[PDB]
Design a protein around this ligand. Structure first.
Ligand SMILES: CCCCCCCCCCCCO[C@@H]1O[C@H](CO)[C@@H](O[C@H]2O[C@H](CO)[C@@H](O)[C@H](O)[C@H]2O)[C@H](O)[C@H]1O
Ligand SMILES: CCCCCCCCCCCCO[C@@H]1O[C@H](CO)[C@@H](O[C@H]2O[C@H](CO)[C@@H](O)[C@H](O)[C@H]2O)[C@H](O)[C@H]1O
Ligand SMILES: CCCCCCCCCCCCO[C@@H]1O[C@H](CO)[C@@H](O[C@H]2O[C@H](CO)[C@@H](O)[C@H](O)[C@H]2O)[C@H](O)[C@H]1O
Ligand SMILES: CCCCCCCCCCCCO[C@@H]1O[C@H](CO)[C@@H](O[C@H]2O[C@H](CO)[C@@H](O)[C@H](O)[C@H]2O)[C@H](O)[C@H]1O
Ligand SMILES: CCCCCCCCCCCCO[C@@H]1O[C@H](CO)[C@@H](O[C@H]2O[C@H](CO)[C@@H](O)[C@H](O)[C@H]2O)[C@H](O)[C@H]1O
Ligand SMILES: CCCCCCCCCCCCO[C@@H]1O[C@H](CO)[C@@H](O[C@H]2O[C@H](CO)[C@@H](O)[C@H](O)[C@H]2O)[C@H](O)[C@H]1O
Ligand SMILES: CCCCCCCCCCCCO[C@@H]1O[C@H](CO)[C@@H](O[C@H]2O[C@H](CO)[C@@H](O)[C@H](O)[C@H]2O)[C@H](O)[C@H]1O
Ligand SMILES: CCCCCCCCCCCCO[C@@H]1O[C@H](CO)[C@@H](O[C@H]2O[C@H](CO)[C@@H](O)[C@H](O)[C@H]2O)[C@H](O)[C@H]1O
Ligand SMILES: CCCCCCCCCCCCO[C@@H]1O[C@H](CO)[C@@H](O[C@H]2O[C@H](CO)[C@@H](O)[C@H](O)[C@H]2O)[C@H](O)[C@H]1O
Ligand SMILES: CCCCCCCCCCCCO[C@@H]1O[C@H](CO)[C@@H](O[C@H]2O[C@H](CO)[C@@H](O)[C@H](O)[C@H]2O)[C@H](O)[C@H]1O
Ligand SMILES: CCCCCCCCCCCCO[C@@H]1O[C@H](CO)[C@@H](O[C@H]2O[C@H](CO)[C@@H](O)[C@H](O)[C@H]2O)[C@H](O)[C@H]1O
Ligand SMILES: CCCCCCCCCCCCO[C@@H]1O[C@H](CO)[C@@H](O[C@H]2O[C@H](CO)[C@@H](O)[C@H](O)[C@H]2O)[C@H](O)[C@H]1O
Ligand SMILES: CCCCCCCCCCCCO[C@@H]1O[C@H](CO)[C@@H](O[C@H]2O[C@H](CO)[C@@H](O)[C@H](O)[C@H]2O)[C@H](O)[C@H]1O
Ligand SMILES: CCCCCCCCCCCCO[C@@H]1O[C@H](CO)[C@@H](O[C@H]2O[C@H](CO)[C@@H](O)[C@H](O)[C@H]2O)[C@H](O)[C@H]1O
Ligand SMILES: CCCCCCCCCCCCO[C@@H]1O[C@H](CO)[C@@H](O[C@H]2O[C@H](CO)[C@@H](O)[C@H](O)[C@H]2O)[C@H](O)[C@H]1O
Ligand SMILES: Nc1ncnc2c1ncn2[C@@H]1O[C@H](COP(=O)(O)OP(=O)(O)O)[C@@H](O)[C@H]1O
Ligand SMILES: Nc1ncnc2c1ncn2[C@@H]1O[C@H](COP(=O)(O)OP(=O)(O)O)[C@@H](O)[C@H]1O
Ligand SMILES: Nc1ncnc2c1ncn2[C@@H]1O[C@H](COP(=O)(O)OP(=O)(O)O)[C@@H](O)[C@H]1O
Ligand SMILES: Nc1ncnc2c1ncn2[C@@H]1O[C@H](COP(=O)(O)OP(=O)(O)O)[C@@H](O)[C@H]1O
Ligand SMILES: [K+]
Ligand SMILES: [K+]
Ligand SMILES: [Mg+2]
Ligand SMILES: [Mg+2]
Ligand SMILES: [Mg+2]
Ligand SMILES: [Mg+2]
Lengths: 132, 437, 436, 132, 132, 132
């Protein structure tokens, strides 16, 4: 029912649009104001915040949210650090998007429940669509 | 703690919050004043609109006498209005300043402090403690003269009025009987000096005084230096120009003249109280006070005109320009060109509205230019000092004063935020030169 | 031809050329005015200095009557003095603008017409305009004044009108010709064209076939604002003074409009008066103060903050009230340094004006409107008197002289300081200051 | 007739100066403000805008103009993007300058109506000129 | 005591914050106005200047200060030039941060009095700390 | 007795310094105002001008000068065109500084009386100094 999406890039905004279509509350948060405005018309609540800030994550009660998606791609260090802060925040389910195999290794060990690699994961499905 | 905000969803909306907030309180305040519960005789629509605008803007201009025309309930309403108008602007201006910093801080992190509730609590706490300190000093003298129940009321009304830079008085002649009373004059003087100093100045000094003056914010240093010079220059200039005038200061003692000169020097910067009569002031003294009223109080305070920091930036931008220096420097800090443009634009725009307002006043009512100019500045600068025009103000003149009081109260702050966040555009025209000078 | 210059050596020296040039004609002009050859009774050092400042700055303010107190040789000197003031200021402004453009072009080439011809065109345009005005004035004065005296009056008044000086040979400056349309329109056309600016005249002369759309932005601003300013002033003066018996109530319907148009035009630096400003309604003195402050065109014989400066500030204000990113005028962005220059000119002018009014109020005892009007007229070089100049004291005369000097050269000088500040090697960190 | 010329290089400014000299109103658009200033002297209207931005092109109202000439030379990606946006904005006739035979074929697929190769076409023209 | 620190990166701002916390008055100089702003918060006086320029260094009056610390790390050329200009200015004691042994030898030849290699010196410190 | 130097780089400023110290009239011309100001103290007359502009070269009576030195190095086209314009202006002797061998060949074919290649010529000179 209630979801949170951190990082509103091309991947993160795509999650927000589909989540809203199924009638679910989505908290879209992004450091960049422009990207938050784009998702403002597609989510229940759009907030400009830095999710690397520990106190900011405390205020945004992410432990209440059923699932939290971290969709930060360019800065590998932010996604790793935001994943950790969400874990101490009490988030039971943490989904993290990783662009590299080395990042996906770190995220697995630090405790991410689901690691998403869009290029590798889309590669497998597109092959399956080609086969059938 | 949590540094975040909800974007509006790209021009700033601070201008709209500022106006809606004033009118959202102006209209309810106007309708209440018409009821006979608050007035012994009842106020007409224009008089109530004028009185509400004067109270909400804390201008202090009065079409009717505050002490006599209003009832006991009416004066209590008047305290609520000028507490909403003065502390409310300081609370709102600091609140909007906080959100501006939050948006600016997050913008920096995207490219490469206490919460709001604690800030609002400190602002209200600072107001009530400041009024309470002024309350006991004013009570110390008026309770023996006027009794207990009446003495505390006059102390509370005037301490609230002084701190909020309102200038509303319960006496027929506003503080003209206490020209030679240092305790009343200094208690009131301290109230609107700190009430008009600005919370950012009070806050910066409160948290970083041990570091020293050198490490205070540049705005705090400007207000901590320009205010004493504005007080000192005004005190000396008023004393020099009016020492030989029998009608205003020639009949007072040597100490009484300095106490009167200092009081009007301080009251001009938005309070609006008067130990003497400005109706019988020398013209060179009216021109000095017009400049003092225009400069006004601090940026995030209970009162003000164009504000001291705006005048200070323009004053040193002018000094920079006349010396052909590339940058405007204050306390070893460069004032960026957008800030300089903001200060110059405010003065130019204020003069444009002022000139239009003076021209309209001369048509609606017939009076000399000095009387009209002084009244227009006081209404625009929110000082509320009268030179006799408000007593004989005509019906159309009251409408102009109401508009000028509204624009003068919110204009400098609103125009600053318009300059801060202009609407982004996708079409730019080629730059071309225009000859000036 | 050749686009080159000799660098100064070692900030711009345009400010220094502007002041030295004025003081290098004021002191000689002053020392000459004391001689009894030019005055029937002789001028005191204060009076001679005031007259020299009023002539060289073409302010037109008079501590003594021009027609009576000066001899035949004195008036010839006065034509030379106001001719030098107006025409030489226009020529120097055009020359400094030409050098500024030359340096800018060479800088642009480094990163990535003739001056003599320009000066010839400036003088020939002035002589042609003054000759046309002289012919039109002679056609009216020679029949009633003679073949010698009427020609002299026509030449004097044409030179004064073109140079935006306002010096008159009559006791009342053109108050006897309030109902005469020929002389009023002749003089009006002379300081409108004299005050338009030679850049505008040249742009119209060379590119009128291309159309209004392809004129320079400054030319369009002048060609639109000058008719608008004239029309607004005329309508406002007619509305505010139609029922005033002492100035315009006694005139006919055509006479009232002619007088209103003449004051609307003369306020922009000429300084002639077909009515009495001493008996003007205050709502009309405020309008005329606003008109005097705006003044004539930038590179012209007139003064004021200049119409282009007022236009950029008026358009910048509209941009700020609408929260637009750029100041746009005629589909062209006005660069932020230009807006800053205009606003700074207005603010500095207001500061010096306030100081001058305060000093006058200390030295002289008069109402605020009279002192303010005289201060605005002297700073703007309009020279319109409201009855206070006749009673000027010695310190008042000194203050007026200083104000006339700073008013004549202050705007262009301050504009050039903002153009070329001294480069620095030490910058302090940027910090924010709360405004409003 | 009203023409819009996008890109004010050597080719675009030559088309504008030739079009305006014949009495036609030209709109000159470029991202480089220096070349927009240079064209603004003789062009009916000159605008500093990014024509790959689809919202910006709607503001320019390129659908009104009879012909739109896109003269972006160095940036091929910007050339195809501008052609695509102009076609999607409802422009009847789009003329595009192409620096290569591969770019020209892509522009043909996009929907460009006339494609000009400055080097090849001028080569043919001078070859004919020397013969006759 | 008066200190001058040139270059306000990690090392330069750490030296300034320590010097000012110890009650000494430090001058912070950097070409990056962004970093000069953080220093200006706690530094007695902060200046945006280029310290490879002889006239600029003469304006700074570095000969007044007891010790001049040059903390230009990435630009070795700027570090050498700043040390040379400071020595030619007439400053008694120059401390220079060097990230290379060859740069350290060149700075010794120039006239630097104390040369700090943060990586190697920190390695020695850390080894001693682990041993004891 | 009377010389002209066009281009006030390191080479041309050295030419001006030696020529004036020897006691001759030197017209130093450079499009960049900073270098003209730098050489103004030394030379008899320093002028900011573009010597690629034909009318400027006509106005500067370079035909009256005994020798003209063209010391433009960075832009080869500027040096070639300045040499051509100076030769058309009637300058009898034109000395041109060339940085490359192709530029030297072009300048020789144009008609420059003396071509100076500073690196090769100092190469020979310092070799002879080393030998003896
Ligand atoms: C929490 C905030 C506390 C605010 C405290 C303010 C304290 C102020 C005290 C001022 C000094 C006391 O002031 C005191 O006033 C009372 C009441 O009128 C006077 O007492 C009076 O009582 C009655 C009043 O009709 C009469 O008999 C007579 O007029 C007088 O004696 C005293 O003569 C004076 O001493
Ligand atoms: C909360 C902000 C406002 C607080 C402002 C600062 C505190 C209030 C003002 C304190 C200073 C005025 O304090 C005043 O000093 C003067 C000295 O001139 C003295 O004033 C005295 O005046 C005369 C004697 O001269 C006596 O008749 C009178 O009763 C007594 O008050 C007292 O000491 C005090 O009345
Ligand atoms: C409402 C009215 C309030 C009135 C009071 C407000 C004005 C107060 C003026 C105090 C002026 C102190 O003046 C200022 O002192 C500071 C110390 O802080 C000096 O500063 C000096 O010491 C500091 C250390 O603290 C060094 O970092 C600094 O480089 C050095 O200059 C300044 O050189 C001097 O300009
Ligand atoms: C660079 C800026 C410099 C700013 C200069 C500031 C100078 C300040 C000097 C103040 C001079 C005070 O001078 C004072 O003037 C006033 C007002 O005119 C004179 O006042 C006189 O005229 C006024 C009318 O205006 C009468 O009402 C008054 O009764 C009479 O005394 C005083 O007799 C004189 O003492
Ligand atoms: C730097 C910013 C500017 C700073 C401004 C400083 C202004 C200083 C004002 C000093 C005021 C004069 O000081 C004040 O004089 C009055 C008048 O005599 C004295 O007043 C006292 O004596 C007088 C007699 O003259 C009595 O009538 C009066 O009832 C009594 O209170 C006060 O006890 C004293 O406090
Ligand atoms: C007390 C001293 C006063 C003088 C110092 C400076 C005064 C400057 C006056 C600036 C002009 C008045 O400012 C005027 O504010 C109104 C709102 O009230 C603006 O109008 C604005 O209203 C809303 C709500 O505020 C804004 O969101 C919106 O941007 C705009 O519509 C006008 O566009 C502006 O012209
Ligand atoms: C009724 C009229 C009253 C007139 C009152 C005018 C008040 C003006 C308030 C000015 C406020 C202080 O303004 C600040 O002053 C400091 C003094 O430390 C100046 O400080 C600087 O001054 C100059 C600037 O070249 C240098 O000597 C040096 O860099 C530094 O001392 C700042 O440049 C200015 O930003
Ligand atoms: C006619 C309407 C006038 C109002 C419109 C604008 C008026 C603006 C007035 C600007 C202030 C007066 O301008 C004043 O000019 C003098 C020179 O005369 C300058 O002083 C300058 O003198 C020399 C020679 O001009 C300059 O090279 C040098 O930069 C500086 O010393 C002052 O630094 C400046 O303050
Ligand atoms: C390039 C410069 C050209 C200059 C052009 C000047 C044109 C001026 C046209 C004036 C028209 C003719 O003006 C003429 O003046 C003369 C001389 O006073 C007047 O005088 C006429 O009557 C008076 C009586 O008082 C006789 O003394 C006089 O001899 C006779 O000419 C005429 O009534 C008028 O007809
Ligand atoms: C060089 C710049 C200045 C040149 C200015 C333009 C040329 C001079 C002004 C030309 C316009 C005024 O021209 C004037 O027009 C009016 C019409 O109202 C007429 O004026 C007429 O007024 C009345 C009749 O009404 C007659 O008594 C009078 O003799 C006659 O002049 C004439 O035609 C001419 O005198
Ligand atoms: C001293 C007072 C002088 C008074 C006269 C000065 C004011 C003259 C006003 C003339 C106004 C013409 O108004 C202007 O005409 C031009 C033609 O040039 C029109 O321009 C139109 O045609 C031109 C071709 O020439 C196109 O390039 C342009 O895109 C189109 O808009 C403008 O859209 C219109 O705004
Ligand atoms: C957004 C800005 C809007 C600008 C608005 C401009 C409005 C212009 C209206 C002009 C009104 C003219 O209105 C005119 O006023 C004057 C001066 O007060 C009145 O004049 C009246 O009072 C004056 C005193 O001042 C007497 O000298 C005069 O004899 C008498 O008639 C006229 O009777 C009236 O006709
Ligand atoms: C757009 C910018 C502003 C444009 C301004 C336009 C202003 C127009 C002014 C029109 C002036 C009135 O026009 C002028 O009226 C006067 C006065 O009646 C007429 O004057 C004529 O008749 C009157 C009788 O009334 C006689 O006294 C007079 O001797 C004679 O010349 C003129 O023949 C006519 O030219
Ligand atoms: C006594 C008081 C008198 C007050 C008089 C006020 C006059 C102010 C100066 C006006 C001079 C003309 O001002 C000029 O008008 C033209 C009219 O098409 C405007 O023209 C422009 O309007 C807008 C501006 O975004 C656009 O459509 C386009 O850029 C262009 O058409 C200029 O932006 C303006 O600068
Ligand atoms: C109201 C009556 C008239 C009063 C108003 C006068 C307005 C005109 C102001 C003229 C100002 C001249 O002042 C202008 O600034 C300063 C002060 O001298 C000079 O500045 C120069 O000398 C000062 C001396 O301290 C140095 O610090 C500075 O670095 C240097 O540039 C300018 O070279 C001069 O041009
Ligand atoms: N600390 C952070 N807190 C919140 N959002 C962040 C943070 N760091 C990055 N983001 C956002 O995460 C999103 C991921 O975008 P990314 O793929 O990294 O870059 P790009 O937008 O260039 O493709 C961006 O919208 C970015 O603003
Ligand atoms: N996205 C764009 N929108 C508008 N104009 C562009 C865009 N990209 C490039 N241009 C312009 O197209 C012009 C032609 O490009 P180019 O061929 O590099 O210049 P030239 O033709 O002078 O060699 C350039 O001046 C450039 O400013
Ligand atoms: N010429 C110079 N003058 C002053 N400061 C300089 C100069 N050149 C570089 N700097 C500054 O010196 C510092 C050197 O630190 P650097 O190694 O670049 O960064 P960091 O230590 O943060 O990784 C930087 O702040 C740099 O901008
Ligand atoms: N057209 C020109 N006219 C006059 N001087 C020029 C022209 N083009 C270049 N110069 C000058 O010639 C000088 C020589 O340049 P260059 O050999 O590159 O020296 P540097 O490498 O020090 O810049 C330059 O400084 C430049 O200012
Ligand atoms: K008030
Ligand atoms: K004049
Ligand atoms: Mg992305
Ligand atoms: Mg091209
Ligand atoms: Mg470092
Ligand atoms: Mg070189």
């Amino acid at each position: 029912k209630q979801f949170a999406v951190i990082g509103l890039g091309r991947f993160g905004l795509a999650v927000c649009k589909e989540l809203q279509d199924s009638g679910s509350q989505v908290l879209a948060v992004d450091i960049n104001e422009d990207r938050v405005k784009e998702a403002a018309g597609f989510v229940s609540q759009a907030i400009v915040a830095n999710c690397t800030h520990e106190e900011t994550v405390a205020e945004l009660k992410l432990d209440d949210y059923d699932m939290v998606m971290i969709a930060i791609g360019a800065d590998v260090n932010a996604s790793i650090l935001a994943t950790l802060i969400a874990k101490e925040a009490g988030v039971k389910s943490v989904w993290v998007k990783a662009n590299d195999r080395f990042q996906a290794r770190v995220l697995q060990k630090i405790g991410a429940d689901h690691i998403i690699m869009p290029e590798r994961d889309m590669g497998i499905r597109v092959a399956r669509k080609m086969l059938d | 703690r949590g540094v975040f905000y909800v974007p509006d969803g790209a021009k700033g909306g601070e201008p709209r919050i500022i106006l809606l907030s004033f009118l959202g309180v102006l209209l309810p305040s106007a309708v209440l004043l018409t009821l006979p519960v608050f007035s012994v005789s009842g106020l007409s629509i224009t008089d109530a609109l004028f009185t509400a605008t004067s109270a909400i803007s804390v201008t202090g201009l009065g079409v009717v006498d505050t002490g006599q025309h209003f009832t006991l309930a009416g004066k209590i309403l008047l305290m609520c209005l000028m507490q909403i108008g003065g502390l409310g602007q300081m609370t709102l201006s600091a609140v909007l300043l906080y959100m501006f910093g939050v948006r600016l801080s997050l913008r920096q992190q995207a490219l490469a402090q206490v919460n709001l509730r604690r800030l609002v609590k400190k602002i209200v706490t600072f107001a009530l403690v400041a009024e309470a300190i002024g309350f006991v000093f004013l009570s110390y003298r008026w309770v023996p003269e006027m009794g207990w129940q009446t003495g505390m009321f006059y102390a509370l009304f005037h301490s609230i009025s002084a701190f909020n830079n309102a200038g509303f008085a319960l006496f027929s002649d506003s503080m003209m009987s206490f020209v030679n009373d240092p305790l009343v004059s200094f208690t009131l003087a301290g109230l609107f000096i700190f009430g008009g100093l600005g919370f950012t100045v009070i806050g910066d000094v409160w948290r970083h005084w041990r570091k020293g003056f050198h490490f205070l914010h540049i705005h705090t240093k400007i207000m901590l230096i320009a205010t004493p010079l504005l007080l000192l220059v005004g005190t000396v200039l008023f004393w020099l120009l009016e020492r030989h005038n029998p009608n205003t200061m020639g009949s007072l003692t040597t100490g009484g003249q300095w106490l009167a000169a200092f009081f009007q020097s301080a009251s001009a910067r938005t309070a609006g109280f008067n130990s003497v009569d400005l109706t019988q002031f020398t013209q060179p003294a009216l021109l000095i006070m017009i400049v003092l009223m225009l400069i006004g109080a601090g940026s995030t305070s209970t009162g003000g005109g164009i504000k001291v920091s705006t005048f200070a930036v323009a004053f040193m931008a002018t000094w920079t320009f006349l010396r052909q220096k590339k940058h405007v420097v204050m306390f070893k800090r460069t004032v960026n060109w957008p800030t300089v443009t903001k200060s110059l634009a405010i003065i130019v725009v204020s003069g444009a509205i002022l000139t239009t307002a003076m021209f309209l006043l001369m048509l609606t009512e017939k009076a000399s230019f000095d009387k009209v100019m002084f009244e227009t500045i006081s209404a625009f600068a929110t000082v509320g000092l009268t030179a006799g025009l408000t007593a004989e103000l005509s019906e159309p003149g009251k409408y102009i004063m109401i508009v000028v009081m509204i624009i003068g109260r919110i204009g400098p702050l609103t125009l600053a935020y318009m300059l801060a966040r202009p609407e982004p555009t996708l079409i730019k025209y080629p730059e071309d030169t225009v000859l000036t000078g």
